[PDB]
């Protein structure tokens, strides 16, 4: 095969093998075989040896197996340079920007105005086929695989220049950014302060499977190798965005034409209105001269172009003192921290109570009490302490310390892992979760108990904990909330049938500290009865499979809890089987 042909196949092989490694270990819907997949991975290595030049440590071959094809974060120089934009914060400067451009033709020049997203990335394509995709700077990290987890990014193009380098951004939508931040808070990890960083991390994952469960989307706006001077007949910035879309590239961020600094400013304000109506955090707009041909004459500065500019929304950050900190208790039992700030003004709305997330965040940022703090809006939606103003410390700041007891039940607290929490099985703060967990198919299957009925039974006062479900024997109780006997009797038998699930499913229902779906069964077989387990010694618990010293000494305490004993007894009496099924 000719030198060129080998290159082409080598790109295609590296692709299909990356595609199917995704189609397999990530999506789980493979098309080709598990053995017919190795027929390509071996040929990749064959051409990679009779043409050693094309050896790229990005190739699948450098770390193979039946393991997830991880992305090599090796530094890579982009064909063309990826510049950054200069920042304007007033119409005076935007006007001055157009004035700077007046060193040639007339007065009001036409532009294309689009919104500002988060997370810069470049994607190099050869003969339409995709080679790599990197991060940013001057040299960027290779992360092709993690970019495959975003279904919108196209692999094969058509009618494109031999060497195409399309740019754009990979971002995480607010909803997702918020979902991720919640999972992190509960686990006791440090949360992200914005979508840029969260998109960064979610893309800087060894296991591309992780990147997939994160929101991650991508939008594309600019070209490089391939723009006009190469093969594309693109003349307008507006045509480019449509061109990009047509070729299968996802252009989701907003854009529209505008005449002169005056008209640019018209789009700006119309944008500033919708500053928090977009599915993503946009901190400004980007006005670019629409005539591509005029981009050549107009160069770049040391670190920025001349034909384009970034008009930014006002920075909504304010300084204030953290007066006191109060504690709340989540649905899962986790004692959450809340800082009571000196009333300040961010975007008109008055901020006075801000979240401190968890003990880690408080520790990282070194958040104390008498402290002055800079508070901002993460994702431009959730107020939080961006960082403390250290130097202004009077020395009398008090360090944030958790309470001995749970503020919502009085039970002594316990630090399970990285976050403080309430062990009390009957804590009122944990009722809804307790009931649901117990009703799920994995636990004691009780289908009728929808997420709504549980809170209705809780609100009305008919249920305080798990055992009370069995005392609802009276359908007279169930015949008032959207149910009318036809729906009542059907659930009455479910609460009844659930009595019969064994110790295995029963231990998993009462959610003990750490006792998983498997840890419950291995625990139930080894004890036979709830009574026996309640008399377990520390040793007997450790001797069990998967039970660590840390989880043994935990189960041991919950077992002796006068409240756990109570809940168990009241469930026994209702006739719930305490044995192994
Ligand atoms: P902002 O001051 O937050 O800077 C964001 C950087 O990312 C690039 N960028 C974001 N969004 C776009 C669009 N829509 N078009 C072109 N470039 C964008 C810029 O290079 C900013 O420097
Ligand atoms: Zn409690």
253 C-beta closer than 6 A to ligand 1: yes
Q: Does the C-beta of 88 come closer than 6 Å to ligand 1?
A: no
Residue 493 tokens read as 């038998």
Cβ atoms of 16 and 40 closer than 8 Å: yes
Tell me the pairing of strands 372-378 and 318-329: antiparallel
At residue 388, the 3 state secondary structure works out as: strand
H-helix or E-strand containing 553?
helix 549-560
How far apart, in whole angstroms, are the C-alpha atoms of residue 54 and residue 48?
6
Q: Tell me the β-bridge partners of 408.
A: none
> Rounded distance, CA 186 to CA 315, Å?
30
**∠319-390-352 over CA atoms, to 5°?**
30
CA 277 to chain centre: 19
What angle do the packed helices 431-439 and 451-459 form, to 10 degrees?
140
Instruction: Give me 570's structure tokens.
Output: 């009241």
Strand 110-115 versus strand 284-289 pairing type:
antiparallel
C-alpha to C-alpha distances, 535 to 55, 97, 126, 531, nearest whole angstrom: 63, 79, 69, 7
Q: Give CA–CA dist 87/90, Å, rounded.
A: 10
Task: Supply 241's token pair.
Answer: 């965005």
DSSP 102: T
Q: Looking at the chain, how many residues does it have? A: 581
Distance CA 553, CA 557 (A): 7
Tell me the CA–centroid distance for residue 497 and ligand 1, in Å: 59
Q: Which ligand is nearest to the CA of 240?
A: 1
Q: Which atom of ligand 1 is nearest to the CA of 196?
A: 3
**Which residues crowd ion ligand 2, with CB under 5 Å?**
406, 408-409, 422, 424, 427
Which element (helix H / strand E) includes 534?
none
What's 53's DSSP letter? G
CA–CA distance, 200 with 73 (Å, rounded to integer): 12
- Please choose, from the candidates 263, 264, 257, 260, the residue with its C-alpha nearest in 3D space to the C-alpha of residue 240: 257
8-state DSSP, 397:
P
Closest of 192, 254, 264, 246 to residue 219, by C-alpha: 254
**What 3 state SS string does 268-283 have?**
HHHHHHCCCCCCCCCC
Q: Name 404's Cβ contacts closer than 8 Å, sequence gap at least 6.
A: 412, 413
Resolution (A): 2.9
Q: Is residue 436 a contact partner of residue 454, using CB atoms and an 8 Å limit?
A: yes
Question: Is residue 116 annotated as part of the catalytic site, yes or no?
Answer: yes
Q: Which of 290, 310, 314 maximizes ligand 1 atoms within 8 Å of its Cβ, making it the mutation to test the pocket?
A: 310
For residue 323 the two structure tokens come to 């007066």
Q: What is the torsional sign of CA 353, 359, 363, 364? A: negative
Taking the centre of ligand 2 as the mean of its atom positions, its distance from the CA of residue 361, in whole angstroms, is: 23
Does residue 169 have its Cβ closer than 6 Å to ligand 1? yes
- Contact between residue 260 and residue 109 where contact means Cβ atoms under 8 Å apart: yes
Known binding residues for NAD(+) are: 34-38, 84-85, 114-117, 169, 221, 288, 312
Q: Is 360 helix (H, G, I), strand (E, B) or coil?
A: helix
Ligand 1 touching residue 117 (CB < 6 A): yes
DSSP of 446-510, one letter per residue?
Answer: -TT--HHHHHHHHHTTS-SSGGGGGGG--HHHHTTSS--STTHHHHHHHHHHGGG--HHHHHHHT
Question: In sequence order, what DSSP letters do the residues of 428-443 get, joined into one string?
Answer: GGGHHHHHHHHHSTTS
Count of C-beta atoms within a 10 Å radius of residue 311: 26
* CA–centroid distance, residue 538 to ligand 2 (Å): 25
Report the distance separating Cα 23 and Cα 512, nearest Å: 37
CA torsion sign for 383, 386, 391, 393 is: positive
Q: Does the C-beta of 286 come closer than 6 Å to ligand 1?
A: yes
Q: Please give the C-alpha separations between residue 470 and each of 20, 92, 229, 432, 438, in angstroms, as whole numbers.
A: 51, 71, 77, 16, 13
Q: Whose atoms come closest to the Cα of 168: which ligand?
A: 1
Q: Which ligand sits nearest to residue 313's alpha carbon?
A: 1
Q: Which residues of 391-421 are buried (b: 16+ CB within 10 A; e: fewer)?
A: eeeeeebeebebeeebebbebebbebeebbb
- DSSP states of 2-44: -HHHHHHHHHHHHHHHHHHHHHHHTT----S-SSSSHHHHHHH
Using CA atoms, how far apart are residues 349 and 346, in angstroms rounded to an integer? 6
Three-class secondary structure of residue 519 per DSSP: helix
114 lines ligand 1 (CB under 6 A): yes
283 CA: nearest ligand 1 atom: 3
CA distance from start to end of the chain: 66
Annotated binding-site positions: 34-38, 84-85, 114-117, 169, 221, 288, 312, 406, 409, 422, 427
Q: Are strands 87-88 and 308-312 parallel, antiparallel or unpaired?
A: parallel
Distance CA(321)–CA(148), nearest Å, equals 45
Tokens for 95, please give them. 């006007």
Distance separating alpha carbons of residues 424 and 410, to the nearest angstrom: 9
3-class DSSP state of 406: coil
Sheet holding 217-219, edge to edge: 129-134, 120-126, 163-171, 217-219
Looking at the CA of residue 114, tell me the nearest atom of ligand 1. 14
Number of the ligand 1 atom closest to the C-alpha atom of 85: 22
Distance 536 CA to ligand 2 centre (A): 25
Domains of the chain: 1-76 (1.10.287.610), 84-118+251-310 (3.30.1490.70), 119-250 (3.30.470.30), 317-389 (2.40.50.140), 430-498 (1.10.150.20), 499-581 (1.10.150.20)
Q: Please check whether residue 534 is in contact with residue 400, taking contact to mean a CB–CB distance below 8 angstroms.
A: no
Q: Which atom of ligand 1 is nearest to the CA of 221?
A: 15
Tell me the three state secondary structure of residue 304.
coil
Q: By alpha-carbon position, which residue is closest to atom 20 of ligand 1?
A: 84
Those residues whose C-beta lies under 8 Å from the C-beta of residue 377, and which sit 6 or more positions away, are 316, 346, 347, 383, 384
Query: What would you report as the CA-atom Rg of the chain, rounded to the nearest whole angstrom?
Result: 30
Q: Among 331, 284, 329, which Cα is nearest to 310's?
A: 284
DSSP 557: H
Give distance in angstroms: CA of 85 to centre of ligand 1: 7
Residue 556's nearest CA partner among 571, 576, 570, 535 is 535
Q: Is the CB of 505 under 6 A from ligand 1?
A: no
Q: Which atom of ligand 1 is nearest to the CA of 119?
A: 7
Please list the helix, strand and coil fractions of the chain in percent, rounded to the nearest 5, in that order: 35, 20, 45
Q: What are phi and psi of 439, to 5 degrees?
A: -90, -20
* Ligand 1 contacts CB of residue 20 (under 6 A): no
What are the binding residues for Zn(2+)? 406, 409, 422, 427
Please calculate the CA angle 276-280-286 and round it to the nearest 5 degrees: 85
User: What is the distance in A from the centroid of ligand 1 to the CA of 259?
Assistant: 21
Kindly state the DSSP code that residue 541 receives in the 8-state scheme.
Answer: H
Ligand 1 contact, 221 CB (< 6 A): yes
How many whole angstroms separate alpha carbon 336 and alpha carbon 360? 11
Tokens of 209: 């499977």
In whole angstroms, give the CA distance from residue 227 to residue 94: 26
**Could you tell me if the CB of 82 is within 6 A of ligand 1?**
no
Sign, Cα dihedral of 440, 442, 444, 445: positive
- Which H/E stretch holds residue 258? strand 255-259
255 Cα: distance to centroid of ligand 2 (angstroms): 51
**Closest among 229, 277, 255, 267 to 91, alpha carbons compared:** 267
310 in ligand 1 pocket by Cβ < 6 Å?
A: yes
CA–CA gap between residue 276 and residue 332 (Å, rounded): 30
Instruction: State the Cα–Cα distance between residues 106 and 103, nearest whole angstrom.
Output: 9
Rounded distance between C-alpha atoms, residue 281 and residue 273, angstroms: 13
> Is 25 in contact with 209 (CB distance < 8 Å)?
yes
Residue 573 backbone class (left: φ over 0; alpha: ψ -120 to 50; beta: rest): alpha
Could you tell me where the DSSP H helices lie in 255-396? Answer: 260-273, 293-297, 359-364
Which residue has 């600094």 as its token pair?
A: 261
From the candidates 45, 116, 235, 418, which is the catalytic residue? Answer: 116
Query: Which protein residue has the closest C-alpha to ligand 1 atom 3?
Result: 283
What are the backbone angles phi and psi of residue 405, rounded to the nearest 5°? -105, 165
């Amino acid at each position: 095969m000719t030198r060129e042909e080998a290159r082409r196949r080598i790109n295609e092989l590296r692709d299909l093998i990356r595609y199917h490694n995704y189609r397999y270990y990530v999506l789980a819907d493979p098309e080709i075989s598990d053995a017919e997949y190795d027929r390509l991975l071996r040929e990749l290595k064959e051409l990679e040896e009779r043409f050693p030049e094309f050896k790229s440590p990005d190739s699948p071959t450098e770390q193979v197996g039946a393991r997830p094809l991880e992305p090599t974060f090796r530094p890579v120089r982009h064909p063309t340079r990826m510049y950054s934009l200069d920042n304007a914060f007033t119409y005076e400067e935007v006007l001055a920007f157009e004035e700077r451009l007046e060193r040639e033709a007339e007065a009001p020049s036409l532009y294309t105005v689009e919104h500002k997203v988060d997370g810069l990335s470049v994607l190099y394509y050869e003969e339409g086929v995709w080679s790599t995709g990197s991060g940013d700077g001057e040299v960027g990290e290779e992360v092709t695989q993690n970019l495959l987890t975003i279904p919108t990014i196209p692999r094969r193009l058509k009618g494109v220049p031999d060497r195409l380098e399309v740019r754009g951004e990979v971002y995480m939508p607010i909803e997702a950014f918020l979902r991720l931040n919640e999972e992190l808070e509960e686990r006791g990890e440090k949360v992200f302060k914005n979508p840029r960083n969260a998109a960064a991390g979610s893309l800087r994952q060894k296991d591309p499977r992780v990147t997939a469960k994160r929101g991650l989307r991508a939008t594309f706006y600019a070209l490089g190798l391939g723009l006009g001077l190469e093969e594309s007949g693109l003349k307008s910035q507006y045509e480019l965005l449509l061109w990009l879309k047509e070729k299968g590239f996802p252009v989701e961020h907003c854009y529209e034409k505008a005449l002169g600094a005056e008209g640019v400013e018209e789009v700006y304000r119309r944008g500033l209105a919708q500053r928090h109506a977009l599915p993503f955090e946009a901190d400004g707009v980007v006005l670019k001269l629409d005539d591509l041909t005029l981009w050549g004459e107009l160069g770049y500065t040391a670190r920025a172009p001349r034909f384009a500019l970034a008009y930014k929304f006002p920075a909504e950050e304010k300084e204030t003192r953290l007066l006191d900190v109060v504690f709340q208790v989540g649905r899962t039992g986790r004692v959450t921290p809340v800082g009571v700030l000196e009333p300040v003004f961010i975007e008109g709305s008055e901020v006075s109570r801000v979240t401190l997330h968890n003990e880690s965040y408080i520790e990282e940022l070194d958040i104390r009490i008498g402290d002055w703090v800079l508070v901002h809006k993460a994702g431009g939606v959730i107020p939080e302490v961006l960082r403390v103003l250290k130097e202004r410390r009077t020395g009398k700041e008090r360090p944030i310390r958790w309470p001995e007891a749970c503020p919502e039940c009085g039970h002594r607290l316990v630090k399970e892992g990285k976050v403080h929490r309430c062990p009390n099985p009957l804590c009122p703060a944990k009722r809804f979760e307790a009931i649901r967990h117990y009703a799920s198919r994995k636990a004691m299957d009780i289908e009728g108990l929808g997420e709504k009925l549980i809170e209705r039974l809780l609100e009305k006062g008919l249920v305080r904990d798990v055992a009370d479900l069995y005392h609802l024997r009276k359908e007279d109780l169930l015949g008032l909330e959207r149910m009318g006997e036809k729906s009542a009797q059907n659930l009455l038998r479910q609460i009844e049938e659930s009595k019969h699930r064994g110790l295995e499913r029963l231990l998993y229902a009462l959610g003990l500290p750490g006792v998983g779906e498997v840890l419950a069964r291995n625990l139930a077989r080894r004890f036979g009865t709830m009574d026996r387990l309640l008399e377990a010694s520390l040793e007997e618990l450790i001797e069990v499979e998967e039970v660590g010293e840390l989880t043994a000494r935990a189960i041991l305490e919950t077992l002796k809890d006068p409240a756990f004993r109570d809940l168990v007894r009241r469930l026994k009496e209702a006739g719930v089987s305490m044995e192994s099924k």
